[PDB]
Write a protein that binds this ligand. Structure first.
Ligand code: NA
Ligand code: NA
Ligand code: NA
Lengths: 4, 302, 301
């Protein structure tokens, strides 16, 4: 699915 | 007597509190600039602390290589901590990375393993697990979403800095949720160690409000957004739902517009997720309930 | 209550980090000025030139800042102006990056692009034409001559080095652009703290006009890639009389040294940071400085  | 850090990992934190002039009510919105950090983000604190605990845990030893799936700030934080302390590191992430980001990570000495952009974080998580499984003795995955060193370091540093810098008069903490470690650790620090029952406010995207929906007892429906750093689409295990008092949602347009206003009107440089956090806090700050309350907002990154 | 009223007050208090793979038994310590509100050392002089012009009455409500820009001082002044409610105009060659245009326009800057053929010379010219058209409303700060540049380093950067080393600093190494860092730090430590440390200026091999001037040789400026230093003249804010030594680094060594800092220490530093470290490392290997605590300014990440 975000960039953390 | 001397303040000389033994390596770059120890220089994390002690970030500044700056009052906003064009948001909130009578100066009640105060931001914490986590961009003023080694690697220019909030993530340096957990980069350092997951490495520090893994050393005291015995799970990361000399010659062991770090493996972590991250497309974001956590990769840069872990990369510089790994270089600063002499560890090999592999980062898996999809192929949508900025090209400057690629050169930055390999400049730091990261073994970059790229996966299909269409498989997103799930493809990178799977490849990271595969690499570790290949030779468990040779690798360690720190797992930022579950590792307790993540919220633990914000309980020991970020929280107390807010407590100290506000002379204990902080009333509200507004923090976007990525891993949840920031809001989790700050709340534990202030509600439990300092024993003040502040209002802890999580911020998530209107597009993916999995926390709001979970707390309201609704079907969770994650969706895509552009607020980089938050809205993972699940409730991370480092988010302790029990210390959340309120959830504010900000859409991507508003977050971006608020970030642009932060730069043009306050002269503060911060990412889109900082704009989201400030939009949420500004919305609250003009409510009678919070008219008298000192609101501290986390600005996660440059 | 450590809550600053605007972002300009959060300058400074940058960390000292000892280097593991340079120097002799830990005698090279770097001051990371990237950890600043606009992520360079220029944050300190942007804030103070504004502060001091306010204190002097030359900068007053309704007056606008006008400045030529090729780098970190333009960014620093932009955010101080935004933080303190000033309109600001920056002149810059139309040949600059898209990324640098959007950042300054993002900070609220009135951008005026000049003839790319004229380069920086044409941007200085346009800035002056703009102040001369209306002296009532425009103010030009002038980083190369404004004493508030070295003055802020005497009051903050210098004392921070003294505080954090418990006055064990023996050597300060700093690249020279405006000269304000090296001049203000040296004055603080030599004059205010009364320690005759060794002050080392660092300039490009390609453009060694400090070395040439001090040696009594013809000045031969040249082009280089060490952004932030080597302006090709002796800036007024460089006090030649507190310089004890000048080291020259070529662009190749500076960029290699920056990459070492990144890969071997996990420190992100600009190319001028690399030049400063290569100079410090070179000195740290000599017997003269083998037992000296050397403090290296890293101007930016
Ligand atoms: Na960002
Ligand atoms: Na400049
Ligand atoms: Na630079």
């Amino acid at each position: 699915e975000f960039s953390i | 007597s001397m303040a000389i850090y033994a390596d770059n990992s120890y220089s994390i934190g002690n970030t500044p509190l700056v009052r906003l002039k064009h948001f909130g009510h009578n100066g009640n919105v105060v931001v914490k600039i986590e961009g003023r950090n080694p690697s220019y983000s909030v993530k340096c604190r957990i980069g350092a602390n997951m490495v520090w605990q893994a050393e005291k845990d015995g799970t990361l030893t000399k010659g062991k290589e770090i493996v972590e799936p991250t497309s974001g700030n956590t990769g840069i934080a872990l990369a510089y901590v790994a270089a600063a302390r002499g560890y090999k590191i592999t980062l898996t992430m999809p192929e949508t990375m900025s090209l400057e980001r690629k050169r930055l990570l390999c400049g730091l000495g990261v073994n970059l393993v790229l996966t299909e952009g269409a498989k997103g974080m799930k493809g990178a998580i799977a490849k990271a697990e595969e690499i570790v499984a290949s030779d468990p003795s040779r690798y360690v995955m720190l797992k930022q979403f579950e590792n307790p060193a993540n919220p633990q370091i914000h309980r020991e540093t970020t929280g107390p800095e807010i407590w100290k810098d506000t002379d204990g008069k902080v009333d509200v903490v507004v923090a976007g949720v990525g891993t949840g470690g920031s809001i989790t650790g700050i709340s534990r620090a202030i509600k439990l160690d300092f024993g003040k029952q502040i209002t802890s406010v999580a911020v998530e995207p209107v597009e993916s409000p999995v926390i709001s929906q979970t707390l309201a007892g609704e079907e969770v429906k994650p969706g895509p957004h552009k607020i980089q750093g938050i809205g993972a689409g699940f409730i991370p295990k480092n988010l302790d739902l029990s210390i959340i008092d309120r959830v504010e949602t900000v859409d991507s347009d508003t977050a971006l517009a608020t970030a642009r206003r932060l730069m043009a009107e306050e002269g503060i440089l911060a990412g889109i997720s900082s704009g989201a956090a400030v939009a949420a806090a500004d919305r609250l700050a003009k409510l009678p309930e919070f008219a008298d309350k000192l609101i501290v907002v986390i600005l996660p990154s440059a």
